[PDB]
């Protein structure tokens, strides 16, 4: 109880300042306390950094979390924390299982039917069960409605282990942080060969933040997943990716039949979240028991998933 | 192409040559079927040699050889006594 009282008493909001306008002698000591509060909450000392931890409840927002109920064979325990997960829409109304995908188990949903592929098939060796999770991949990519049945649910922050019927928790909206109050930062892990920086392909104003966009795109061999990092807005990166998708407008020209509406859409772009632009993405390497793939490490993520907008 | 298979046997060399002819008797038919020994030097079908003796109770415990990203399975003979011999042809 003494430990609990000493822990609650430090983690308490400071009381609001009163100015008794009515009385005379109380107003003087209250504005005395007011200037003694400002003078120790502004100057260079340890008092002004002591004041920042009280948080005075607009600036800080506890995020929302998504409790998802998944199968253990459709997931892997050995993955990193900050993997952006992609929930699949289920046709049955009372289902109970929300089939999510890490980018590697979704990369084996990409390639099985046609670096990243090595660690992908090292993490998810048998793809028949993962092709049995989705009821239709080839027809749904044939009519190109796969982008709306796949919704992103933000990066994983807590994975409680279970041998059957695993349960994961992702931040769907808000500042990406862990769930356990022994506090740590959830660094968003993105594999590098799917990650491209848009200034690199662009080859002048400083923003506030540099956002991260996923773009499920419909290449003619199969689907493709590419994580786009842009300092610009959403309706600006639609135009910028219209510039980037140069041979797609030639392919949609060279499939000249217009009544076949399948090749008239080329993927869709969804905004995942906002990390800071003054601190860029860090490169890192993620190791399995045998292999190591280079992985983009992204810190200070604020997840806010947007709709898929058609290129 | 030629092959390099490593045999573990508890029996002597006079037994290993007979059991190696017995083990490779289909491959002699295969090599006689797919090509024809039109010359006299194509008659020999390989040769074997003893690489050394190890204990029969605890030998050939399997392990792995882990390189940078891939690992092939390896067999690990412990307490080996190397004693190589000249090649004995199998025909």
């Amino acid at each position: 109880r003494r430990r609990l009282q000493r822990r609650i008493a430090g983690l308490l909001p400071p009381p609001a300042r009163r100015l008794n306008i009515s009385r005379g002698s109380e107003f003087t000591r209250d504005v005395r306390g007011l200037v003694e509060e400002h003078a120790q909450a502004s100057s260079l000392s340890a008092a002004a950094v002591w004041r920042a931890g009280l948080l005075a409840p607009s600036g800080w927002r506890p995020p929302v979390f998504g409790d998802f109920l998944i199968h253990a064979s459709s997931f892997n325990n050995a993955e990193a924390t900050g993997t952006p997960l992609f929930q699949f829409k289920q046709s049955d109304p009372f289902s109970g299982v929300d089939a999510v995908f890490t980018p590697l188990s979704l990369f084996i949903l990409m390639n099985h039917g046609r670096g990243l592929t090595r660690m992908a098939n090292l993490l998810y060796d048998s793809p028949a069960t993962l092709a049995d999770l989705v009821p239709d991949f080839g027809r749904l990519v044939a009519d190109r409605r796969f982008h709306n049945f796949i919704t992103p649910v933000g990066p994983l922050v807590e994975n409680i282990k279970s041998t059957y019927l695993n349960k994961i928790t992702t931040v769907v909206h808000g500042p990406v942080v862990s769930k356990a109050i022994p506090r740590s930062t959830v660094k968003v892990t993105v594999p590098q060969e799917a990650f491209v920086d848009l200034d690199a392909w662009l080859s002048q104003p400083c923003p506030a933040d540099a956002r991260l966009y996923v773009a499920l795109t419909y290449e003619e061999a199969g689907p493709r997943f590419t994580f786009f990092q842009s300092s610009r807005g959403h309706c600006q990166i639609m135009n910028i990716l219209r510039i980037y998708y140069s041979p797609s407008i030639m392919h949609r020209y060279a499939v000249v039949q217009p009544l076949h509406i399948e090749e008239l859409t080329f993927g869709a772009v969804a905004c995942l979240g906002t990390f800071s632009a003054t601190d860029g993405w860090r490169r890192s390497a993620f190791n399995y028991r045998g292999s190591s793939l280079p992985v983009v490490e992204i810190d200070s993520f604020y997840s806010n998933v947007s709709d898929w907008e058609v290129i | 192409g030629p092959r390099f298979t490593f045999f573990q046997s508890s029996r002597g060399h006079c037994q290993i040559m007979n059991i190696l002819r017995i083990y490779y008797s289909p491959s002699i038919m295969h090599r006689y079927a797919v090509v024809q020994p039109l010359h006299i030097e194509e008659l020999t079908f390989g040769a074997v040699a003893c690489l050394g003796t190890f204990s029969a109770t605890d030998g050939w415990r399997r392990s792995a050889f882990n390189y940078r990203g891939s690992s092939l399975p390896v067999v690990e003979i412990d307490s080996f006594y190397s004693n190589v011999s000249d090649w004995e042809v199998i025909l």
């Binding site: 929302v64 998504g66 929930q87 289920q90 049955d92 109304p93 709306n148 909206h173 217009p258 709709d307 | -």
Partner: protein
């Protein structure tokens, strides 16, 4: 912050009015404080013609509010901010399941005025709440009421080309995530339909002016029935046609942006609510 907004009810509410306001307590509604123009009820009044586009522009202009508590004289409600979230519920009599959909659209209720309303006999106003529904259902009901308005006005003018049962068989049902709903298809939705009609009529000459602005590359992709219009038209008529067409195109594009698009995270089907923020 302090966000509790109260509205000024003139007359005290009776028991059935309390029950009907309690029945839909979790839903959202716009805002203009006056109880007269408290929501969408001044477009859905008997005073004006129920025009869709002015209703949409009023719904996208003014702010929204989710109400928490109801009383005999007060209506506790918090308006919407872009900062934080509110827990909202699906309490609409056309029931659409919010199973796992990350987006919610706020549109005027096209399923009839009586379906989403509360009629206050004692007061001065009859309030309505807009439709909060998942966005593939939203664009699907926009398709199946727009094309039904077109294919209905066509058979009112000439019933020799199409069939009413043929369009009512498909254009009266939406099917999203295995749920099969029926559309109450009965005026309404005529100005938006004629706006779309004017757009797709004047879009041939619009595309011709655009491809003549900057050659056979963009002239191959029209088909032969989609290419031929003669090169004789007055300057003022062409300019006014292009200006009015591009005005209706911009309004129609921002209208098929479905307004205030809400986003949800955790839909709890046991309690029928989801954590909802403004996006």
């Amino acid at each position: 912050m302090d966000l509790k907004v109260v509205v000024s009810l003139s007359s005290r509410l009776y028991t059935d009015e309390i029950a009907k306001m309690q029945q839909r307590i979790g839903c959202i509604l716009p805002l203009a404080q006056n109880v007269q123009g408290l929501g969408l009820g001044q477009v859905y009044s008997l005073e004006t013609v129920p025009d869709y586009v002015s209703m949409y522009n009023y719904l996208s202009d003014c702010t929204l509010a989710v109400l928490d508590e109801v009383s005999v004289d007060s209506l506790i409600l918090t308006k919407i901010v872009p900062g934080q979230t509110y827990a909202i519920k699906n309490k609409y009599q056309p029931f659409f399941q919010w199973h796992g959909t990350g987006s919610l659209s706020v549109m005027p209720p096209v399923f009839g005025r009586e379906h989403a309303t509360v009629k206050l006999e004692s007061n001065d106003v009859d309030i309505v709440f807009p439709m909060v529904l998942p966005t593939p259902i939203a664009e699907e009901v926009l398709q199946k009421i727009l094309l039904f308005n077109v294919y209905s006005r066509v058979v009112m003018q000439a019933p020799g080309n199409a069939d009413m049962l043929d369009v009512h068989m498909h254009l009266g049902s939406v099917s999203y995530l295995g749920h099969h709903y029926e559309l109450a298809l009965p005026a309404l939705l005529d100005n938006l339909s004629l706006y779309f009609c004017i757009m797709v009529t004047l879009l041939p000459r619009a595309s011709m002016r655009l491809v003549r602005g900057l050659n056979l590359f963009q002239e191959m992709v029209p088909d032969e029935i989609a290419r031929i219009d003669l090169d004789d038209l007055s300057v003022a008529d062409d300019l006014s046609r292009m200006r009015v067409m591009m005005t209706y195109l911009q309004s129609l594009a921002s209208l098929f942006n479905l307004g205030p698009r809400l986003a949800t995270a955790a839909y709890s089907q046991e309690t029928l609510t989801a954590t909802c923020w403004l996006r």
